[PDB]
Amino acid sequence: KAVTFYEDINYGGASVSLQPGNYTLSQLNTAKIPNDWMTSLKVPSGWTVDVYENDNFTGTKWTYTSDTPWVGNDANDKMTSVKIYST
Ligand SMILES: [Ca+2]
Ligand SMILES: [Ca+2]
Numbered sequence: 001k002a003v004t005f006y007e008d009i010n011y012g013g014a015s016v017s018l019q020p021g022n023y024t025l026s027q028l029n030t031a032k033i034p035n036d037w038m039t040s041l042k043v044p045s046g047w048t049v050d051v052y053e054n055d056n057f058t059g060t061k062w063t064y065t066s067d068t069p070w071v072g073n074d075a076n077d078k079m080t081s082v083k084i085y086s087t
Contacts, residue, residue, distance in 0.1 A: 004017045005033060047087070049084050052083075
């Protein structure tokens with residue numbers, strides 16, 4: 001089980017899976033996840049994903065605790081850093 005971030009709505013386009021952790025922008029990029037690119041994501045039930053507008057877990061924070069086929073226009077293409085918890 002893991003969190004999978006997708007480039008497009010409805011889990012379309014490019015996708016990358018990550019385990020729990022605290023990922024900065026440069027770390028996402030290394031994982032092949034570009035800046036301001038996340039549109040949808042699958043989340044293991046019970047897990048928590050805190051998506052941040054800016055790098056180093058700052059800026060606006062959006063939280064997801066389940067598969068989300070459309071993060072919506074407000075959070076769309078804004079992820080720069082993210083914290084994933086298996087709780
Ligand atoms: Ca996108
Ligand atoms: Ca951003």
